Amino acid sequence: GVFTFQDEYTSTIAPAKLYKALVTDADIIIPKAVETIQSVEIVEGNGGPGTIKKLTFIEGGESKYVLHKIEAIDEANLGYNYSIVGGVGLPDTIEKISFETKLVEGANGGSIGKVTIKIETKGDAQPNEEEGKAAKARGDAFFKAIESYLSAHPDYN
């Protein structure tokens, strides 16, 4: 089956600046900002489509990682699309999970981070609800941490 979900994250940070932090400077800013992410590293590629990034994080006390494959990267339109192409642990009901993200102008000069999540399962298997909730909660924490960090360090590098 194919399932879609929509998240929106509000930020006080202006969209092009937030995109720069999330995308262009991800490898530097994200580990600094996000207290559960230890590193964001390029495994292969030049930064364009097909690039694989390894994001190492702590969960339940254990060091784990996920691999992201860049599907599209469009700074002009503040777009970034990627898929998850590896991780730690046994297979589950997800055959594939991918993301289409866009940043747009929000309130008082801030942003809204839009995310469409596409989950593909085998046959009539359903997405795991607890996981979706946890994933969204991580998304909230991720944007909060980035907002707090960029508020405290509006300049950098």
Ligand X SMILES: C/C(=C\CNc1ncnc2[nH]cnc12)CO
Comparing CB distances to Ca ion, the nearer of 31 and 106 is 31
- Spatial contact of 117 and 6, defined as CB atoms under 8 Å apart: yes
Judged by beta carbon distances under 5 to 8 A according to partner kind, the member of Ca ion, ligand X, none in contact with residue 31 is Ca ion
Nearest CA among 118, 151, 152, 150 for reference residue 26: 150
78: left (phi over 0), alpha (psi -120 to 50) or beta: left
In the complex, the residues that contact ligand X under the rule CB under 6 A are: 5-7, 19, 22-23, 26, 30, 36-37, 40, 53, 55, 57, 59, 66, 68, 80, 82, 99, 101, 103, 113, 115, 117, 127, 129, 132-133, 135-136, 138-139, 142
Comparing CB distances to ligand X, the nearer of 133 and 153 is 133
Provide, rounded to whole angstroms, the least separation between the CB of residue 108 and ligand X. Answer: 20
Find all residues with CB under 8 Å of 20, minimum gap 6, and list them. Answer: none
Judged by beta carbon distances under 5 to 8 A according to partner kind, the member of ligand X, Ca ion, none in contact with residue 138 is ligand X
Q: How far is CA 51 from the centre of its chain?
A: 15
Comparing CB distances to ligand X, the nearer of 107 and 137 is 137
Residue 53 CB neighbours (<10 A): 23
Judged by beta carbon distances under 5 to 8 A according to partner kind, the member of ligand X, Ca ion, none in contact with residue 100 is none
- Spatial contact of 107 and 124, defined as CB atoms under 8 Å apart: no
Check residue 31 for interaction with Ca ion (CB under 5 A).
yes
Q: Which residues are annotated as a binding site for Ca(2+)?
A: 31, 34, 37
